Amino acid sequence: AGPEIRRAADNLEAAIKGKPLTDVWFAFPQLKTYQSQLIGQHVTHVETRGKALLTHFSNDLTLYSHNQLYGVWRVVDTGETTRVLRVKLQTADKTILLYSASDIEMLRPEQLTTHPFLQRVGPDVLDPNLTPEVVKERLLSPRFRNRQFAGLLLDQAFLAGLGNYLRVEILWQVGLTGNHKAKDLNAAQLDALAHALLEIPRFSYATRGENKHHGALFRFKVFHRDGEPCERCGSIIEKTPFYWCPGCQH
Ligand SMILES: [Mg+2]
Ligand SMILES: [Mg+2]
Ligand SMILES: [Zn+2]
């Protein structure tokens, strides 16, 4: 439920990211008003949100889509099927076409945060478009800034692709217990956590074969390891399931 979806987003970027739109067409009448408005604009990036895609444009509009059962994005050359065409984004060389999907809507910035589906699933830590600056935004946003990291880091509504084993490594790297909230953190701390939320998860994926003959480049610090000393201070790691060093984490 992760490796894919990001694949569709990348196909669409490769095809038209940064390229000026020469034609924009939507099948739905309520979307017609954005056509001439997008001409000359370009997709800045395509964000993944569960099985949904967010196609951002340089004028701050964001096309949201959820293929659900039938929708399919096809790339072609500007010029080129029994399926009903719903969206057509055309540049000089490449053109992307959305077929069948019914869940298609245009969103203004302020609308992102309130969309029912989007409030339920956040950006993926593995998504290259996700930047530490964005993470800080969500952390600080009035919707999360008051949540303890213990559960926040286990809630997909905040960030997708965050397994418990990652939650404990991230917190140990910034020296924090699960009881803190982004509101009580100073700038330096907030940024530290922001990078940790991305780097650790990504560093974990880009590795791992085998452990029976070779040890992975990425090693756990407190996941499991309970009852073992901490590499930093030497205190014995504990478990609650949270894993932490009560010695250098507070
Ligand atoms: Mg080997
Ligand atoms: Mg503290
Ligand atoms: Zn320690």
CA of 210 to the centre of ligand 1 (A): 7
HEC string of the chain equals: CCCCCHHHHHHHHHHHECCCCCEEEECCHHHHHHHHHHCCCCEEEEEEECCEEEEEECCCCEEEEECCCCCEEEEEECCCCCCCEEEEEECCCEEEEEECCCEEEEECHHHHHHCCCHHHCCCECCCCCCCHHHHHHHHHCCCCCCCEHHHHCCCCCCCECCCHHHHHHHHHHHCCCCCCEHHHCCHHHHHHHHHHHHHHHHHHHCCCCCCCCCCCCCCCCCCCCCCCECCCCCCECEECCCEECCCCCC
Q: How far apart are CA 249 and CA 176, in angstroms?
A: 5
Going by the DSSP 8-state scheme, the letter that residue 160 receives in this structure is B
PDB experimental method: X-ray
Token pair recorded at residue 126: 């593995």
CA of 217 to the centre of ligand 1 (A): 12
Ligand nearest to the CA of 179: 2
CA of 213 to the centre of ligand 1 (A): 6
Q: How far apart are CA 204 and CA 165, in angstroms?
A: 10
Going by the DSSP 8-state scheme, the letter that residue 32 receives in this structure is G
CA of 96 to the centre of ligand 1 (A): 43
Helices marked H in 153-219 — which ranges? 164-174, 187-205
Q: How far apart are CA 102 and CA 249, in angstroms?
A: 48
CA of 173 to the centre of ligand 3 (A): 10
CA of 143 to the centre of ligand 2 (A): 21
CA of 62 to the centre of ligand 3 (A): 44
Give residues with Cβ within 8 angstroms of 37, minimum separation 6: 59, 61
Ligand nearest to the CA of 178: 2
Residues surrounding ion ligand 2 at CB below 5 Å: 250
Rg, the chain, Cα only: 21
CA of 201 to the centre of ligand 2 (A): 23
Ligand nearest to the CA of 248: 3
Token pair recorded at residue 229: 């000393």
CA of 238 to the centre of ligand 2 (A): 17
Buried b / exposed e along 146-168 (16+ C-beta atoms within 10 A)? ebebbebbeeeebbbbbeeebbb
Helix axes 187-205, 164-174, angle to 10 degrees: 140
Token pair recorded at residue 216: 């992975």
CA of 208 to the centre of ligand 1 (A): 11
**Domains, the chain:** 1-122 (3.20.190.10), 123-250 (1.10.8.50)
CA of 137 to the centre of ligand 2 (A): 21
Resolution of the entry in angstroms: 2.3
